[PDB]
């Protein structure tokens, strides 16, 4: 059995989210198919050599990633589809049996047979039972879950004859994301995929997580005869053939019209033409060069390893404590060696303010802060807004005096039902008579009075002196300003030390020789995380380099000198002549050795290794690196596209182009030298 390979132009597009958008180009990093890749071309033959002998190309294809299963059927060739995990009756199964008025999905662990045939011939008066024949199964077990979906997830139109359908699958643990559509080609050419753009929308999702490692195709026999030329052959000789693809986690681009339809699709890791469309949110690239990324991408799973801690932070003992204190001796309690869970905080009260100066509350959940302090106090209602960076000293800002560079939140809420009393309201006080402005995070517990110039007041107020710590009077007979408000000012600290307070993120495994996403102890990187031999201090983390780019970070659990080298060469420019002129790009390398590309060593579209090639696309060495994709001529022109080191690029036809002659030249890429005249 010999199989061929066919390419895809622009098909296999799928909506990533489940919402509608209008004039919004969203960029996401998920799993989707790649055009211009090889697809298997299993040619299915329908023949019979006996009553029990059936010949059909039913091979156990291995879906390391999800694959496209086309539906190029005439009437009823493909009706179902099998999915196995081990083919040994050890994992849950799934069947998409979408037949006439019967769309029952069975997910029972069964070991039926090795080859599954399908016919539409009633065995013995099968009009009373279901239309699905009982020759598919051989036993029965405990039924876990079933589906009684009424709508048919199968497009069948026996009038057109051609079936250019697109179907994809998603093997996620959350849902299945079954996307099925159907189109029709206007030309009766061979069984090839037509060119053009197309998108798929989800129809039915399955919340059952099943480990899928083996895939099998299902075909309907529909022979009913043994000799060619009958009412089922010759006139309807429609032995079909289907293709299978594979997924690779890359970055995709999608556009949404005013109605919500996708027009085009751009993959960053296909050609240097499309690399400029991802780094810059645009589809009409201008003439010149741009700074983009190489063909490398991110893998399926990321690494988010955090320090080994299993203790919960005592945030409950902070917010809903029994009794608070006046703001001259605010209760500041540090939190360390625990796991931060910023979810029980919202379960306390309808907070009037949640101003998080510094770290945004979105990323505040997972950053692995060094230490966390919890300052709790009761301030006046209309004076809560003064507890913030800035806010020049008011009558209450001389007690806390938040600094100008704060990296925490300010949670506050009214407590009139726990603090206000008819008589007992003098327990809460505030400092009013101060000498100088306090320092950030500095308390000034004191009972000495302020001398009023004339005579030194020695513990007695008398004529003009006044005792400090005046009462607030938080009685339940005021408005919304003169009410007690319990404020919890969480302050996060980030110093060079092993982190002790992290978010609720699990710890993954270590994958060295792979370009996985770097998320160690809050640091975000996208380089090669492998073993190195750098020199680090014993208790020092988050190492840096001569530049501000993070070069190495020690693992939080098992100390390890692991450096972060970039997955791309970085200095890989892209010469774009414009999406409205041509589609030729000369790749520029900024001071690098011979082309390696560790990720795409032998990709489909490889610009180097084109020494013996005509009409442009040649390799040359420059002072700023290597020039691949153009030619060199001893002529000179203006600054059309600057390459560097006195060399520039220009998109001209050729040096020999006469409009009155019969010799018409191409429009390849040619590079010239710069002249001063």
């Amino acid at each position, epitope marked *: 059995t010999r199989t061929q390979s066919y390419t895809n132009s622009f098909t296999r597009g799928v909506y990533y989210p489940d919402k509608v958008f209008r004039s919004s180009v969203l960029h996401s990093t998920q799993d989707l198919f790649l055009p211009f890749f090889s697809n298997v071309t299993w040619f299915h033959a329908i023949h019979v050599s006996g009553t029990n002998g059936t010949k059909r190309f039913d091979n156990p294809v291995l879906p390391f990633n999800d694959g496209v299963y086309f539906a190029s059927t005439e009437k009823s060739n493909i009706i179902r589809g099998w999915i196995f995990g081990t083919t040994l009756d050890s994992k849950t199964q799934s069947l998409l049996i979408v037949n006439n008025a019967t769309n029952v999905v069975i997910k029972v662990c069964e070991f039926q047979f090795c080859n599954d045939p399908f016919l539409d011939v009633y065995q013995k008066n099968n009009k009373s039972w279901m239309e699905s024949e009982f020759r598919v199964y051989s036993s029965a077990n405990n039924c876990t879950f079933e589906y009684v979906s009424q709508p048919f997830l199968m497009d069948l139109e026996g009038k057109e004859g051609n079936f250019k359908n697109l179907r994809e699958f998603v093997f996620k643990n959350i849902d299945g994301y079954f996307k099925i559509y159907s189109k029709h080609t206007p030309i009766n050419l061979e069984r090839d995929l037509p060119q053009g753009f197309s998108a798929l929308e989800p129809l039915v999702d399955l919340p059952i997580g099943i480990n899928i490692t083996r895939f099998q195709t299902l075909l309907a026999l529909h022979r009913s005869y043994l000799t060619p030329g009958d009412s089922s052959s010759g006139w309807t000789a429609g032995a079909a053939a289907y293709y299978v693809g594979y997924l690779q986690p890359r970055t995709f681009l999608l556009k949404y019209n005013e109605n919500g339809t996708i027009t085009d699709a751009v993959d960053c890791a296909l050609d240097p033409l499309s690399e400029t469309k991802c780094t810059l949110k645009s589809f009409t690239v201008e003439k010149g060069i741009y700074q983009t990324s190489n063909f490398r991408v991110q893998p399926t799973e990321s690494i988010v390893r955090f320090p080994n801690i299993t203790n919960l932070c005592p945030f409950h003992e902070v917010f809903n404590a029994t009794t608070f204190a006046s703001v001259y001796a605010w*209760n500041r309690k540090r939190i360390s*060696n625990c796991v931060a869970d910023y979810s029980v905080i919202y379960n306390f009260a309808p907070f009037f303010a949640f101003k998080c100066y510094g770290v945004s509350p979105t990323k505040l959940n997972d950053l692995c802060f060094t230490n966390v302090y919890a300052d709790s106090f009761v301030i006046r209602g209309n004076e809560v807004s003064q507890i913030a960076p800035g806010q020049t000293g008011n009558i209450a800002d001389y007690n806390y005096k938040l600094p100008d560079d704060f990296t925490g939140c300010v949670i506050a809420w009214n407590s009139n039902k726990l603090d206000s009393k008819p008589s007992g309201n003098y327990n809460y006080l505030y400092r009013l008579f101060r000498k100088s402005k306090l320092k950030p995070f500095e308390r000034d*517990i004191s009972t000495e009075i302020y001398q009023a110039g004339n005579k030194p007041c020695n513990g007695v107020a008398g004529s003009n002196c006044y005792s400090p710590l005046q009462s607030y009077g938080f009685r339940p007979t005021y408005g919304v300003g003169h009410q007690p408000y319990r404020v919890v000012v969480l302050s996060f600290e980030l110093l060079h030390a092993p982190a*002790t307070v992290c978010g609720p993120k699990k710890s993954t495994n270590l994958v060295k020789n792979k370009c996985v996403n770097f998320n160690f102890n809050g640091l975000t990187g996208t380089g090669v995380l492998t073993e190195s031999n750098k020199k680090f201090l014993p208790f020092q983390q988050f190492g840096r380099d001569i530049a501000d780019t993070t070069d190495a970070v020690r693992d939080p659990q098992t100390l390890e000198i692991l450096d972060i080298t970039p997955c791309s060469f970085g200095g890989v420019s892209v010469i774009t002549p414009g999406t409205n002129t041509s589609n030729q790009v000369a790749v520029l390398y900024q001071g690098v050795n011979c082309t390696e590309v560790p990720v795409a060593i032998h990709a489909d579209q490889l610009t180097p290794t084109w020494r013996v090639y005509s009409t442009g696309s040649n390799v040359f060495q420059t002072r700023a690196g290597c020039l691949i994709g153009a030619e060199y001529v001893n002529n000179s022109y203006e600054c059309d596209i600057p390459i560097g080191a006195g060399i520039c690029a220009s998109y001209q036809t050729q040096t020999k182009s006469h409009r009155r002659a019969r010799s018409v030249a191409s429009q390849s890429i040619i590079a010239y030298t710069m002249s001063l005249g």
Partner: antibody, heavy 122, light 108 residues
């Protein structure tokens, strides 16, 4: 949830050395000033000093040049080498966790140990 | 070196009374004091640090106050589970000294 388990001798001859071990279980050694504190029987509490993770020692002027506190960052341990032990050094030594924050706070002894009596006799 | 001195060496009272233990010093500590407790023979467990701020798991019966040189500790209700020797720890400079112990007794 940090704990401190003490371990050391119980009877030390005079003029010899004195060293015990407090293993840290509950967190890494990068926050507290894991050190010791002595308490003679029937008297008050006397301090020893504080040792940080970045090798920073500071003792009391009384017993300054008789103690050399060390820390083992590898196996998360720290010991107190007390030399020239005399009869006055009979005390119940405890392991405590002190910390003063950079802003200016002075959090007291949060986590304590259990106590290991060190009798000086022969 | 600051020498912490506690005036009441033994405050004998009954269940329901208020005990006021004082702690004076030579040099003036701004606001950083501490109160400990070790009833049978165990290690002194902290109750109120910074002389006003309670610790996680400390009953509301304990309450500290004072500033400068004079600091006090006010136990509202004398629960049977309060017999211990309370201490005062100066926490301003590097050498942290303690008090002299206050054997709080209960008169049944």
């Amino acid at each position: 949830q940090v704990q401190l388990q003490e371990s050391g001798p119980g009877l030390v001859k005079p003029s010899e050395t004195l060293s015990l071990t407090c293993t840290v279980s509950g967190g890494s050694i990068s926050s507290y000033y894991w050190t010791w504190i002595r308490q003679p029987p029937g008297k008050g509490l006397e301090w020893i000093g504080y040792i940080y993770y970045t090798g920073s020692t500071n003792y009391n002027p009384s017993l300054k040049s008789r103690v050399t506190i060390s820390v083992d960052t590898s196996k998360s341990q720290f010991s107190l080498k007390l030399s020239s032990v005399t009869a006055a050094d009979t005390a119940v030594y405890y392991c405590a966790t002190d910390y003063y924050d950079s802003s200016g706070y002075s959090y007291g002894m949060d986590v304590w140990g259990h106590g290991t009596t060190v009798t000086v006799s022969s | 070196d600051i020498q912490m001195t506690q005036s009441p060496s033994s405050v004998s009272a009954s269940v329901g009374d208020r005990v006021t233990i004082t702690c004076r010093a030579s040099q003036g500590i701004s606001g950083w004091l501490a109160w400990y407790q070790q009833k049978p023979g165990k290690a002194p467990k902290l109750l109120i640090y910074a002389a006003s701020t309670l610790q996680s798991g400390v009953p509301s019966r304990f309450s500290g106050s004072g500033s400068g040189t004079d600091f006090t500790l006010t136990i509202s209700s004398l629960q049977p589970e309060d017999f211990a020797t309370y201490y005062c720890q100066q926490a301003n400079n590097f050498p942290r000294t303690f008090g002299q112990g206050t054997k709080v007794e209960i008169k049944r």
